[PDB]
Amino acid sequence: DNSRYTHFLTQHYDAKPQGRDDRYCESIMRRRGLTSPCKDINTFIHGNKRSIKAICENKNGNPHRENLRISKSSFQVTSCKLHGGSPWPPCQYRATAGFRNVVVACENGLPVHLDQSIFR
């Protein structure tokens, strides 16, 4: 077990969204426990998990920068960006759907960190 992998899934994986609008972001950010304080930006990756884990190997990733990995395939993602002045709930979010490759950090063949800089 890797608690950082499980935390990765909680913070950054959502298999099957439908509408990835502002209200999607407000709900899932509350649901995954990311609202006290409001995380300023957070991105969710969609689709299957095997594709995400595959970034940790040659199959679907390349080494990137300082011990990160960058994916070969593009993913459906949604970025939730905090707006308003306050760090505390109610946390209002702007949703930005995207489709591109993702940067992760892996440990023991498992993603444990999502690089958020590429989405801000």
Side-chain angles (χ1 to χ4, degrees), residues 10-57:
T10 303
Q11 294 167 14
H12 299 296
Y13 176 66
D14 182 26
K16 283 169 280 286
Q18 198 90 17
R20 290 139 66 187
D21 59 343
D22 289 8
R23 192 136 66 246
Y24 165 80
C25 275
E26 290 157 6
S27 184
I28 194 158
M29 289 301 283
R30 187 162 35 265
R31 208 154 69 232
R32 303 300 186 73
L34 305 191
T35 52
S36 59
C38 308
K39 204 156 173 278
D40 187 52
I41 181 159
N42 193 73
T43 302
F44 296 91
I45 309 173
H46 315 302
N48 61 53
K49 285 190 277 170
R50 68 179 88 82
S51 290
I52 310 289
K53 297 164 73 173
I55 303 158
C56 301
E57 275 104 32

Side-chain angles (χ1 to χ4, degrees), residues 16-117:
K16 283 169 280 286
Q18 198 90 17
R20 290 139 66 187
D21 59 343
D22 289 8
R23 192 136 66 246
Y24 165 80
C25 275
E26 290 157 6
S27 184
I28 194 158
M29 289 301 283
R30 187 162 35 265
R31 208 154 69 232
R32 303 300 186 73
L34 305 191
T35 52
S36 59
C38 308
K39 204 156 173 278
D40 187 52
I41 181 159
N42 193 73
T43 302
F44 296 91
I45 309 173
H46 315 302
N48 61 53
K49 285 190 277 170
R50 68 179 88 82
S51 290
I52 310 289
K53 297 164 73 173
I55 303 158
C56 301
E57 275 104 32
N58 180 68
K59 177 151 83 280
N60 195 31
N62 295 135
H64 184 68
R65 302 292 179 229
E66 306 117 69
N67 265 332
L68 296 161
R69 311 272 303 167
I70 188 161
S71 75
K72 298 184 164 175
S73 77
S74 298
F75 292 84
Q76 290 289 338
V77 303
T78 311
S79 293
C80 302
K81 171 69 172 186
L82 187 64
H83 76 279
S86 178
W88 297 100
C91 298
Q92 307 157 246
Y93 283 101
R94 260 69 195 282
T96 296
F99 180 64
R100 63 155 300 160
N101 57 356
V102 308
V103 174
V104 303
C106 296
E107 187 148 23
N108 302 323
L110 291 171
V112 296
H113 169 77
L114 185 72
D115 184 355
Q116 285 286 176
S117 55

